[model samples]
Target: KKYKLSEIHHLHPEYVRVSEHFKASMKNFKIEKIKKIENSELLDKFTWKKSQMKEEGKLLFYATSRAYVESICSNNFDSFLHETNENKYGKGIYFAKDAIYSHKYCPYDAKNVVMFVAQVLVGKFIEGNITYTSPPPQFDSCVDTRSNPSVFVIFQKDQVYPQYVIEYTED
Candidate 1:
């Protein structure tokens, strides 16, 4: 059975709102112009563990507007992570644009986007209380109803590989 973005709104309004905001913001620029940050030192700062669900091929990604990254970098990393970790269906991770477009979170304007691709292999680092659910067909992603239940490989692109950033702090 397939699901639509509207279906999620009833269950998770906050995500819907945030996603909408992100999508609208993305319309401001061309996808090609978006800046790419490859900071190995920054990537090195966090240690990612192998996923437990490697057999299932359940690699997930959390996409957001660049504002999110700026906020996290400028304000408080712990607080940003804590707040986003509050979804009842855990946090959302995308496998396709349906989810990305459904939420309309990622900016059409490449300059305003960033994503945290979390590899949920074994679900080791994820919150114990989290519950997982396969999203609708439109959204090629998974939903967890608690906290981030995996390690992330942050980047910005429709599909991206994990690597280092040039100037970790000054973007």
Candidate 2:
């Protein structure tokens, strides 16, 4: 394999980075596990896309239902089928810097919540609207606010790749 999967405990530097930026409430959550994803095909595609756009992108989180977690793990970011798709910032996969807001997409009754910590290329962004199915003309992605965005929307699936799967329980 060109790429190998990696895993780390809470003591790892990567886990520390994720934990620090995870929340606004900053609740004392218990982490179930962290699995680093190394989907070679998807990573290869994402790398090409990143070069084409000249964007390194940001490491953001995608909180989703447990029902979709398995599929996303195997299929990458192509399995984000929500009960009601919220396209406030265009019809695409939604990622956010704030995990609290992203947690809204997960099921409330679940014992554990699953989130995708992925690399999202929100290169040149624009103010998003409902009418945008793709990045408007020259933009690579869109956001809720032009200057300080909490949520980011990506039209192209190649614009993202899940780097880790984070499962945890929060109060």
Candidate 3:
């Protein structure tokens, strides 16, 4: 059993096929250009990787409802809660913290800042507290933040990678 869909089974075993078309397609798959937005001191840049795309794919594949998880990473409140409760906070945090941290919540590092922002954005989006009128085409959902209180729950319950990896060894 792999992740949440333990009950389900694939009728066909996995296999890899090679073709000239596939090779050509791969050759054309260049990294996306990263651009900086105006007035944001934070270096908000993202490049689409195969792993990242697959992560999104798994989210869509598993979700019975709307597939996309909206960005709540920019929500200051959620970021603050996550930082303050770093020890208590696990992989997913979709709620407010009762006890705030003593030290200054310093997500000074660029990567940490990005991650914190993303986490907040996702959390708020999931909680139905925030709304995005013009979301990216890839993740446009019929359910808005206004309707779904459990938006970011998937990050907590589901493994990001749903695929089963098998390793063979001589017995």
Candidate 4:
């Protein structure tokens, strides 16, 4: 089963709340991108390897959600992080006695911020067009995020190469 917030809430109450908020709102957003691959070119250029696939015949793409994109771009993340620090660890640096490490609360790194509408979206090539849909539990209610979502295409061997006519970009 997937990890839940309640499992580690005792270590840091404030961080848990922040993490939960992010996770809960994340399901409401969706990302769509068109990726094309050449026949001669390697599948690695388009999707991840077979071993990397969470299931057979499917590939994974890590994307950013519209809510997170807007939140970070507007400089609102500063207050979010600051509040986390204030609630959990007070100002100033310290040794092991009071250090917030990954085991406790992992803060979002602004330098490499990214968001995703869902964990995995099923991608299929139909009529030379690539389409995406949220899997399982999120099947019926996924909505596209207002902001653009970025994706890194990994290579998966079993998947078919997409037609190379259209240019894929965030909308």
Which candidate number would show the highest TM-score if scored against the true structure?
Answer: 2
lDDT tens string, model 1, 1-171? 111112123235544443443344334322221222343333333332222123232334345555555443322122124223343333433322232332243343444445433223322232222343333333333333225423222121212222211111112
The candidate that wins on lDDT is: 2
Give me the displacement of residue 2 in model 3, in angstroms.
19
List ranges where model 1 is wrong by over 4 Å.
Answer: 1-30, 45-48, 51-59, 71-86, 91-171
Error of 1 at 160 (Å): 13
**Range of the 10 consecutive residues with the lowest summed lDDT in candidate 4:** 94-103
Model 1, total clashes: 23
Instruction: Kindly list the per-residue Cα lDDT of model 2 for residues 9-122, writing each as its tens digit.
Output: 889998888766664434666667777877788888899998998888798888776676666655666524531335767878788877766776544454655877889888
What's the true lDDT of residue 51 in model 3? 29
Q: Which is superior by lDDT, 1 or 3?
A: 1
List the candidates ranked by lDDT, beginning with the highest.
2, 1, 4, 3
Candidate 4 colliding pairs, count: 10
Which sections of candidate 4 miss by over 4 Å? Answer: 1-26, 30-32, 44-56, 64-171
- Candidate 3 lDDT tens digits, 1-171: 111212112232221211121122224222121111121211122212322434332111111011111122121112223333242322233332110111124234322121111211221232222332322344322122335332232222121222221111111
Error of 3 at 126 (Å): 10
Q: What would the TM-scores of all predictions be?
A: 0.31, 0.86, 0.17, 0.17
Give candidate 2 regions above 4 Å deviation.
1-6, 23-25, 83-85, 107-112
